[PDB]
Design an enzyme around this catalytic site. Structure first.
Site, PDB file in Angstrom:
ATOM      1  N   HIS A  41      15.493  26.717 -24.482  1.00 27.51           N
ATOM      2  CA  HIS A  41      15.533  26.608 -25.930  1.00 27.51           C
ATOM      3  C   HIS A  41      15.431  25.167 -26.411  1.00 27.51           C
ATOM      4  CE1 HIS A  41      20.061  26.191 -25.455  1.00 27.51           C
ATOM      5  NE2 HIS A  41      19.856  25.319 -26.425  1.00 27.51           N
ATOM      6  N   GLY A 143      24.471  19.919 -28.611  1.00 26.79           N
ATOM      7  CA  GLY A 143      23.889  18.985 -27.669  1.00 26.79           C
ATOM      8  C   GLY A 143      24.393  19.093 -26.241  1.00 26.79           C
ATOM      9  N   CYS A 145      24.159  21.658 -24.227  1.00 31.77           N
ATOM     10  CA  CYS A 145      23.370  22.551 -23.395  1.00 31.77           C
ATOM     11  C   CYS A 145      22.643  21.757 -22.327  1.00 31.77           C
ATOM     12  CB  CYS A 145      22.392  23.346 -24.263  1.00 31.77           C
ATOM     13  SG  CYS A 145      23.237  24.711 -25.082  1.00 31.77           S
TER      14      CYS A 145
HETATM   15  C1  LIG Z   1      23.495  23.828 -26.603  1.00 30.45           C
HETATM   16  N1  LIG Z   1      23.154  22.633 -26.803  1.00 30.45           N
HETATM   17  C2  LIG Z   1      24.191  24.752 -27.620  1.00 30.45           C
HETATM   18  C3  LIG Z   1      25.683  24.848 -27.240  1.00 30.45           C
HETATM   19  C4  LIG Z   1      26.499  25.615 -28.291  1.00 30.45           C
HETATM   20  C5  LIG Z   1      26.501  24.876 -29.664  1.00 30.45           C
HETATM   21  C6  LIG Z   1      27.978  24.760 -30.127  1.00 30.45           C
HETATM   22  N2  LIG Z   1      28.772  25.235 -28.980  1.00 30.45           N
HETATM   23  C7  LIG Z   1      27.973  25.717 -27.943  1.00 30.45           C
HETATM   24  O1  LIG Z   1      28.446  26.146 -26.900  1.00 30.45           O
HETATM   25  N3  LIG Z   1      23.484  26.059 -27.748  1.00 30.45           N
HETATM   26  C8  LIG Z   1      23.177  26.534 -29.059  1.00 30.45           C
HETATM   27  O2  LIG Z   1      23.497  25.855 -30.017  1.00 30.45           O
HETATM   28  C9  LIG Z   1      22.382  27.843 -29.392  1.00 30.45           C
HETATM   29  C10 LIG Z   1      21.560  28.316 -28.227  1.00 30.45           C
HETATM   30  C11 LIG Z   1      20.840  29.626 -28.487  1.00 30.45           C
HETATM   31  C12 LIG Z   1      21.030  30.550 -27.301  1.00 30.45           C
HETATM   32  C13 LIG Z   1      19.330  29.398 -28.740  1.00 30.45           C
HETATM   33  N4  LIG Z   1      23.209  28.879 -30.034  1.00 30.45           N
HETATM   34  C14 LIG Z   1      24.543  29.294 -29.903  1.00 30.45           C
HETATM   35  O3  LIG Z   1      25.286  28.767 -29.084  1.00 30.45           O
HETATM   36  C15 LIG Z   1      25.115  30.351 -30.844  1.00 30.45           C
HETATM   37  C16 LIG Z   1      26.190  30.094 -31.710  1.00 30.45           C
HETATM   38  C17 LIG Z   1      26.696  31.052 -32.612  1.00 30.45           C
HETATM   39  C18 LIG Z   1      26.135  32.351 -32.776  1.00 30.45           C
HETATM   40  C19 LIG Z   1      26.687  33.380 -33.713  1.00 30.45           C
HETATM   41  C20 LIG Z   1      25.910  34.363 -34.387  1.00 30.45           C
HETATM   42  C21 LIG Z   1      26.486  35.308 -35.241  1.00 30.45           C
HETATM   43  C22 LIG Z   1      27.875  35.300 -35.464  1.00 30.45           C
HETATM   44  F1  LIG Z   1      28.442  36.181 -36.257  1.00 30.45           F
HETATM   45  C23 LIG Z   1      28.667  34.357 -34.822  1.00 30.45           C
HETATM   46  C24 LIG Z   1      28.070  33.434 -33.974  1.00 30.45           C
HETATM   47  C25 LIG Z   1      25.036  32.601 -31.910  1.00 30.45           C
HETATM   48  C26 LIG Z   1      24.536  31.641 -31.002  1.00 30.45           C
END
Ligand SMILES: *C(=N)[C@H](C[C@@H]1CCNC1=O)NC(=O)[C@@H](CC(C)C)NC(=O)c1ccc(-c2ccc(F)cc2)cc1
Ligand SMILES: *C(=N)[C@H](C[C@@H]1CCNC1=O)NC(=O)[C@@H](CC(C)C)NC(=O)c1ccc(-c2ccc(F)cc2)cc1
Lengths: 305, 305
Positions: A41, A143, A145
């Site tokens: 991603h 950041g 990830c």
């Molecule tokens: C990596 N850099 C990052 C790490 C996370 C950001 C904050 N804490 C983390 O662990 N990954 C992401 O930001 C991203 C990656 C996806 C798989 C493309 N998304 C998520 O981590 C994420 C966060 C929250 C939700 C979500 C959706 C609906 C809800 F009701 C509650 C939460 C989904 C995905």
């Protein structure tokens, strides 16, 4: 003496961390030999993350669209491919700090250290357990990830985890270094539920051995039990069944302390039925299940790397 | 999100660890530039440790009696001196992996990472707090002496601790890198008592801020208080008095979360008077005092090194 949650020394992995930037997205990558591994991603914008077609986004990227930096040095990307949920970026320089390493996929109940990173630079190190529902209780911000989890065996680093996402309950999910998720999770920004979790019984018993070794001995009782009767009692408390492989794994601890495994199981059965009654074990008022038998032996015998 | 006890990345310190052997005694040393620092009781036999005259034992040692090894390489000792409770061994090779570093003496209530070592090789890393009674709750076996504790600030390693001994209560004691003990302890094998300990109030408040940031918000109440009334309530629970410097140190956290410091103090006063009533905070059934305000900010903003 003393017993602490302790992580592996991280320097071997610190020498492998790089920053990977594609367009406006930046995260961490693992630089081993002439290949950088990072979450796929990185090729997403903010809008793409709701439902990305990763194969489609990758076609419009060429090698030069990936900016890979190790400290203040750009690594020129000379190739790229996707392997499940990870990207592999071939670069024109082999990492001189590449340790001996393996990629392994760990089982639920096993632990590892996470080296949390931002912008390719290390922030901290902490120990995690792969839960039975395939999540981990980490500490990750934006950041983070591409941060990896690992074990060390003498000189060999076994990488087992790469961080991809956070779940609504606050827990975390990721992949092995072949990009296959642990658990039924996908790398998109959508609500996803973890399965209901379970207590890792063999780890609780390891921790109780650790407690005896460190002076905390009040919970020991005079009784024994059978595997069958223990598992009957422990099922109702959401403890995973204790197998004979688990008993065999606990064998060396029972031999070192001279407390039979089924006697410690009797002690834990009493603790599950009666609680702790205000007392603590190793400082904790809760039964701890994130130490494996091997973590106990490692820390209580002084294994180095 | 998520909040974990997390140690600094250890690689900078791993590149400084050596093995120091004098006669039959072996422990760890810290190799910085062309000087190896290690505990002076490396020059003791088993019999000497009951009441050693260190100055007398050192006169009968010459440079060649110190076997210093970095991995599979002997470092030739070309000089030696004693500085309080540490030995300084000058060697004919400057450590090429010497990081930018300082020696600092920390205050009670501050934290650091310990890189636990055996035979000059790293075993594990964990976070510790210097208690108000000048002890630490570590995990150390035989041969761990010379293991160091440290903080990192960007690129600079501040060494603050070197491990010397264990106390009858299970806790640990050591010196700064000038060899002056923390606390009223001496490096001899004799029973020594730690002062009665106290709870680090400012660290509890930092941890409660960490909890709010991570979703755990049930303990917040609608009240404020005054520093005076809070300290009156908290004295009886063996909490160290909260000064205005402590409030100022908590300032940035209160600004980031929008909860005034004295409002959080009101919440903690209620928690001290009424307990938690079965509920947990950040997974713990006890109030945690081993996170400094800076540890909270560090982990919750993603500071790297
Ligand atoms: C990596 N850099 C990052 C790490 C996370 C950001 C904050 N804490 C983390 O662990 N990954 C992401 O930001 C991203 C990656 C996806 C798989 C493309 N998304 C998520 O981590 C994420 C966060 C929250 C939700 C979500 C959706 C609906 C809800 F009701 C509650 C939460 C989904 C995905
Ligand atoms: C360093 N390599 C080592 C580390 C300790 C050994 C096991 N756990 C440790 O933390 N230091 C020592 O072994 C040694 C150093 C002295 C200062 C020369 N001694 C002690 O750590 C020690 C241990 C126990 C007692 C003691 C005496 C009387 C009692 F009733 C109970 C305990 C004193 C010193």
């Amino acid at each position: 003496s003393g017993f602490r949650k302790m992580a592996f020394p991280s320097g071997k992995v610190e020498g492998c961390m790089v920053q990977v930037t594609c367009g406006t997205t930046t995260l961490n990558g693992l630089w081993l030999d002439d290949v950088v591994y990072c979450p796929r991603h990185v090729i997403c914008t903010s809008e793409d993350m709701l439902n990305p077609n990763y194969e489609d986004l990758l076609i419009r990227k060429s090698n030069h669209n990936f900016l890979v930096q190790a400290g203040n040095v750009q690594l020129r990307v000379i190739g790229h491919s996707m392997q499940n949920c990870v990207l592999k970026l071939k670069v024109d320089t082999a990492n001189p700090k590449t340790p001996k390493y393996k990629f392994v996929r760990i089982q639920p109940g096993q632990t590892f250290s996470v080296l949390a990173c931002y912008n390719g630079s290390p922030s901290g190190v902490y120990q995690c357990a792969m839960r039975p529902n395939f999540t981990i209780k980490g500490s990750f911000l934006n950041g983070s990830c591409g941060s990896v989890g690992f074990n060390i065996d003498y000189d060999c680093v076994s990488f087992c985890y790469m961080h991809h996402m956070e779940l609504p309950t606050g827990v975390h999910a990721g992949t092995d270094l072949e990009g296959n998720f642990y658990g039924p999770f996908v790398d998109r920004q959508t609500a996803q539920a973890a399965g209901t979790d379970t207590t890792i019984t063999v780890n609780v018993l390891a921790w109780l051995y650790a407690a005896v070794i460190n002076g905390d001995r009040w919970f020991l009782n005079r009784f024994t039990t059978t595997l069958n009767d223990f598992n009957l009692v422990a099922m109702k408390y959401n403890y995973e069944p204790l197998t004979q492989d688990h008993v065999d794994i606990l064998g060396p601890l029972s031999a070192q302390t001279g407390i039979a495994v089924l006697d410690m199981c009797a002690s834990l059965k009493e603790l599950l039925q009666n609680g702790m009654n205000g007392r603590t074990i190793l400082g904790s008022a809760l039964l701890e299940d994130e130490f494996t038998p091997f973590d106990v032996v490692r820390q209580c015998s002084g294994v180095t790397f």
